[PDB]
Amino acid sequence: DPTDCADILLNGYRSSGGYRIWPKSWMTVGTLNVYCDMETDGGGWTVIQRRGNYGNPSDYFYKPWKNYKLGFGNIEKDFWLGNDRIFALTNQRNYMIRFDLKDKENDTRYAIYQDFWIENEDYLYCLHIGNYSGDAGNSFGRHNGHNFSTIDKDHDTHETHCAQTYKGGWWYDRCHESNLNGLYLNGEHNSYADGIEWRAWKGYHYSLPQVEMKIRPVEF
Numbered sequence: 001d002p003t004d005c006a007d008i009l010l011n012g013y014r015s016s017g018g019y020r021i022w023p024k025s026w027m028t029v030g031t032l033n034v035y036c037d038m039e040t041d042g043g044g045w046t047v048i049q050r051r052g053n054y055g056n057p058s059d060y061f062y063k064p065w066k067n068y069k070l071g072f073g074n075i076e077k078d079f080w081l082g083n084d085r086i087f088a089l090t091n092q093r094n095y096m097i098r099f100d101l102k103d104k105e106n107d108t109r110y111a112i113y114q115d116f117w118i119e120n121e122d123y124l125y126c127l128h129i130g131n132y133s134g135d136a137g138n139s140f141g142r143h144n145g146h147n148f149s150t151i152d153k154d155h156d157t158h159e160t161h162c163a164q165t166y167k168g169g170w171w172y173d174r175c176h177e178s179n180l181n182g183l184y185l186n187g188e189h190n191s192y193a194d195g196i197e198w199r200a201w202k203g204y205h206y207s208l209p210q211v212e213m214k215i216r217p218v219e220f
């Protein structure tokens with residue numbers, strides 16, 4: 001019955017954690033276990049990505065198209081939900097995406113983008129995002145309207161292979177201002193922009209230790 005975490009919240013469940021949901025497209029992707037953040041600004045957020053120090057290698061997110069398509073990781077630790085699943089959820093209705101970022105000093109920033117959705121695999125999971133708001137700085141905006149790229153599939157608009165240079169699966173442009181699926185370098189680093197970066201806040205030489213991407217219906 002519940003199609004996402006907002007529905008789960010409206011049904012009375014107030015605690016954060018894993019829940020089974022029935023997206024409207026369950027006939028194809030099936031039911032899914034998702035992590036629901038029921039605390040941030042009222043709750044009802046379905047988490048689609050998370051980075052943290054959970055024991056996985058620093059290059060854990062350095063995976064090919066197939067892995068990003070199907071998803072990988074544990075929803076209670078660091079993971080990527082899966083593009084087919086993200087497509088299924090973002091298309092069942094209108095969602096906004098929220099980015100929660102935290103640095104090593106435990107300070108935090110967030111960014112909200114309305115009308116968040118991606119197209120299906122045939123269209124290379126092209127990204128769509130609306131207006132920005134928040135205090136982290138608008139570093140995801142430049143990615144609007146770009147294809148998804150991975151180490152084995154260059155779909156960006158640069159002469160080089162953005163994914164191989166910056167190490168993640170992302171909607172690379174030429175190449176990025178945000179790189180949340182990059183290497184887990186934990187803090188300051190000399191290498192150039194290949195860690196978990198959010199340019200508008202910490203520049204290109206600081207890999208955020210903890211980040212999360214989560215969605216909630218606009219009509220919440």
Ligand SMILES: CC(=O)N[C@@H]1[C@@H](O)[C@H](O)[C@@H](CO)O[C@H]1O
Nearest residue numbers: 166173174175176177192193204
């Ligand atoms: C990590 C990254 O993509 N840095 C690019 C830089 O290579 C490019 O020359 C410049 C053009 O303005 O824009 C930056 O955002």
Ligand SMILES: [Ca+2]
Nearest residue numbers: 154158159160
């Ligand atoms: Ca290229």
